[PDB]
Design a protein around this ligand. Structure first.
Ligand code: SF4
Ligand code: SF3
Length: 553
């Protein structure tokens, strides 16, 4: 196999036998074949748009297919086989439409050779062998490989956010068109300039999509507000919801109301606690545990059903007993888990089986007590802008440090905890994404009532952090966003973080520290382009990085 799309990739080079995440060769290869088929869809879809007869019938399929290949999203080879077969059928429909339109517009049959992605077909028994030759290593040149895979990795992250927006009824044609432009581009022989421009365009589309998702989440569930979230437990059986999807949360809360089953969040569902639409339910207890990588013991000790709405779901340890109460939904899949089918148009998912099972479970084992404060998304922070601006001009706040992104397993991530602990007492940490769990249970206090850790929400709520920076740029009358008293020390793991990074680069943010390592999918020459254009940096020691950040470097 070959996969290098996450921070934990083997030797920071690539997983070649079995993924460090647990992904077996067969699964890895099937994900490659799915992406191959999506490239085929894209070739015809792009051509149809160019001919003035766009077909948007595959929009959701494309988003879901990309999302299913995110790290820790889908482990079920049966699901991939089904998606690949469906993809081939969708592709062939587009092919036939294209051929007819091309002939009408040109007065002759289409005759140009196409990449194999556009033409190869087989039944499911042919997939395993074909998959071996259509993956990342099919691109021989390391710079072409790096730029194509950077694009697809960023694109998957964008697709995830676009899927959540689509679930909520929010779509933009430009996003779905760009999915096909980007995918099709990776079958073409393009210059480095063209390939880099596509990556920058993806960053701009990450801005568009993150804005759309922010609109969707806040229009539907309200603006996040300051909330104190309990991290202890009650004495009722509960259902633990993890991942990111807020519509699943809305439906789970409605369906559990009055049943005697409590609802708890986990991981990237913590920010559901911040939304007024959800705060109204008394049986929504709070948040259980930490970030995704601790889930084996935590899902175990929770005792009730666990619902994974998105990544990250990790393989069960052999000693874990929660498979029989593990539920997947959306793009998530896991062999032997129970999957909750997609909602029908105008309807709702059916969580009744989780509720019935939860009534037979003991309540959660308490693993800590206390609280986490959050809800500082853009409406909330902009409301406080006068107070923040006066604190900066008076010197009470010397600097903001953006420490958003993803958590993960590697012990080097103690860096993030130590930075939070050792930053001067006149700084404020801004966060979003599960990177927060390295420092959100500390006792860092406040500056004149502004907490020293401001949690804007999920990784997608990095959007709020960008909105806040842009607003402060205006209030302070600065010409360059980088001259704000803000430093960026971002942790990354999976592909949504790459989308966020590309958005920040598109917005012109330079000097970002990215860690705890730099992506394996940046070739030396491509890394040089990013350093030259954007001054991206690796992490150093805690002491050195704090000093440099306080100096604005
Ligand atoms: S998702 Fe990450 S750990 Fe898993 S196979 Fe790919 S690079 Fe390796
Ligand atoms: Fe939405 S941030 Fe990226 S790592 Fe897996 S849930 Fe976390």
């Amino acid at each position: 196999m070959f996969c290098f799309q996450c921070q934990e990739t083997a030797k920071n080079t690539g997983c070649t036998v079995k993924g460090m995440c647990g992904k077996p060769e067969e699964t890895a290869n099937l994900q490659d074949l799915l992406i191959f088929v999506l490239r085929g869809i894209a070739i015809y879809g792009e051509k149809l748009k160019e001919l003035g007869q766009p077909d948007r019938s595959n929009d959701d399929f494309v988003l879901q297919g990309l999302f299913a290949t995110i790290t820790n999203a889908n482990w079920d080879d049966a699901r991939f086989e089904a998606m690949i077969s469906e993809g081939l059928a969708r592709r062939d429909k587009l092919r036939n439409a294209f051929l007819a339109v091309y002939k009408a517009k040109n007065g002759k049959d289409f005759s140009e050779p196409l990449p194999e992605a556009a033409t190869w077909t087989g039944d499911s028994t042919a997939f395993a062998e074909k998959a071996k030759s259509v993956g990342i290593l099919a691109t021989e040149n390391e710079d072409v490989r790096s730029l194509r895979e950077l694009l697809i990795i960023g694109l998957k992250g964008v697709a995830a956010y676009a899927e959540h927006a689509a679930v909520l009824g929010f779509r933009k044609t430009e996003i779905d068109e760009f999915m096909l432009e980007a995918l099709a581009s990776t079958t073409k022989d393009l210059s480095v300039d063209e390939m880099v421009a596509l990556v920058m365009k993806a960053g701009g589309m990450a801005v568009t999509t993150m804005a759309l998702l922010d609109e969707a989440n806040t229009t539907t569930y309200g603006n996040p507000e300051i909330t104190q979230v309990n991290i202890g437990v009650g004495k009722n059986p509960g259902i633990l919801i993890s991942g990111h999807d807020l519509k699943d949360m809305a439906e789970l809360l409605k369906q559990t109301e009055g049943t005697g089953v409590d609802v708890y969040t986990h991981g990237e569902m913590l920010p559901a606690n911040y939304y007024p639409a959800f705060k109204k339910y008394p049986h929504f207890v709070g948040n259980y545990g930490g970030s995704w990588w601790q889930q084996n013991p935590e899902f175990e000790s929770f005792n009730g059903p666990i619902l994974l709405t998105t990544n990250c779901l990790v393989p069960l340890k052999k000693e874990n007993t929660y498979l029989d109460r593990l539920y997947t939904t959306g793009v998530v899949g896991y062999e032997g888990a129970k999957h909750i089918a997609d909602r029908p148009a105008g309807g709702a998912k059916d969580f009744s089986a989780l509720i019935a099972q939860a009534k037979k479970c003991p309540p959660p084992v308490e693993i800590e007590t206390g609280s986490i404060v959050g809800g500082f998304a853009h409406h909330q922070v902009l409301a406080l802008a006068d107070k923040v601006v006066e604190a900066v001009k008076s010197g009470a706040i010397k600097r903001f440090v953006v420490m958003a992104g993803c958590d993960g397993r590697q012990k080097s991530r103690s860096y993030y905890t130590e930075v939070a602990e050792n930053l001067p007492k006149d700084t404020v940490i801004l966060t979003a994404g599960c990177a927060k769990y390295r420092y959100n249970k500390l006792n860092l206090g406040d500056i004149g009532g502004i907490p020293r850790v401001l949690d804007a929400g999920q990784c997608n709520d990095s959007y709020s952090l960008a909105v806040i920076a842009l607003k402060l740029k205006e209030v302070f009358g600065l010409d360059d966003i980088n001259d704000l008293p803000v430093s960026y020390d971002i942790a990354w793991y999976e592909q949504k973080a790459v989308a966020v990074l590309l958005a920040l680069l598109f917005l012109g943010v330079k000097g970002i520290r990215l860690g705890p390592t730099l992506p394996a999918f940046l070739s030396p020459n491509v890394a040089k382009v990013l350093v030259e254009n954007f001054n991206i940096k690796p992490i150093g020691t805690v002491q050195d990085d704090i000093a440099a950040m306080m100096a604005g470097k």
